[PDB]
Design a protein around this motif. Sequence first.
Motif, mmCIF file in Angstrom:
data_model
loop_
_atom_site.group_PDB
_atom_site.id
_atom_site.type_symbol
_atom_site.label_atom_id
_atom_site.label_comp_id
_atom_site.label_asym_id
_atom_site.label_seq_id
_atom_site.Cartn_x
_atom_site.Cartn_y
_atom_site.Cartn_z
ATOM 1 N N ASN A 115 0.790 -1.219 0.000
ATOM 2 C CA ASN A 115 0.000 0.000 0.000
ATOM 3 C C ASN A 115 0.822 1.268 0.000
ATOM 4 O OD1 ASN A 115 -2.445 -1.388 -0.017
ATOM 5 N ND2 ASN A 115 -2.723 -1.246 2.187
ATOM 6 N N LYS A 142 1.225 3.647 -1.970
ATOM 7 C CA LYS A 142 0.567 4.794 -2.556
ATOM 8 C C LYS A 142 -0.264 5.541 -1.527
ATOM 9 C CE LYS A 142 -0.354 7.434 -6.205
ATOM 10 N NZ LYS A 142 0.550 7.877 -7.312
ATOM 11 N N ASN A 143 -0.818 4.818 -0.540
ATOM 12 C CA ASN A 143 -1.898 5.327 0.346
ATOM 13 C C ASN A 143 -1.518 5.524 1.810
ATOM 14 O OD1 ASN A 143 -3.725 2.858 -1.422
ATOM 15 N ND2 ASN A 143 -3.918 5.079 -1.794
#
Lengths: 107, 107
Positions: free
Chosen positions: B67, B69-70
Amino acid sequence: DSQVFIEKRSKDSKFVFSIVYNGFTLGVWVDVNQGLMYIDTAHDPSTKNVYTLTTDDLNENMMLITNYKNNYHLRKLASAFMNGYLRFDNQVIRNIAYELFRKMRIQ
Amino acid sequence: DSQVFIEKRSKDSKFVFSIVYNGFTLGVWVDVNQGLMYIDTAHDPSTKNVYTLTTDDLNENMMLITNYKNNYHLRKLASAFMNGYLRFDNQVIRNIAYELFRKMRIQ
């Protein structure tokens, strides 16, 4: 297969330490001015900063917090990787670094 | 039980984000000038920076790299903890943060 973090080490990068992972030696290198770290097969065979990491993990070097006292270069490696600052010479090295990272833990 | 990383948050520290871990909310705070981060129960109930982390892990938030990116605030948290810059308000909070960290991984 996603050759984005794939960069050869820069001219001004300096050796800092090695990891012997199973029996394979990886040299870790820093470009101070760029703020980047590189993992390559090249290394200095006479360094004091050597860390044996193994899949079964007897010396507990996969335990970033268990071994805080002794593992300073590994915790930085893991930081650089997470903060986006790690570069790998090859995709093979990359796949090895990934696998190494997968069995590490923060305990 | 080792009250070394146990410090209450400083006067000048600022809220950055929260983690809801199982159902318990932890507020993360930064003292910019000191270079320290603190985990406390206090938080701002209206923030956009909220991360639900769960033991079974359906949203994959325990996967720091899956994850990337987030999960920017989680990767920093994990860095600060490993680089020695995380502080906890209480020993209870500390034991919770430790447990949270134990199920995280770098994949």
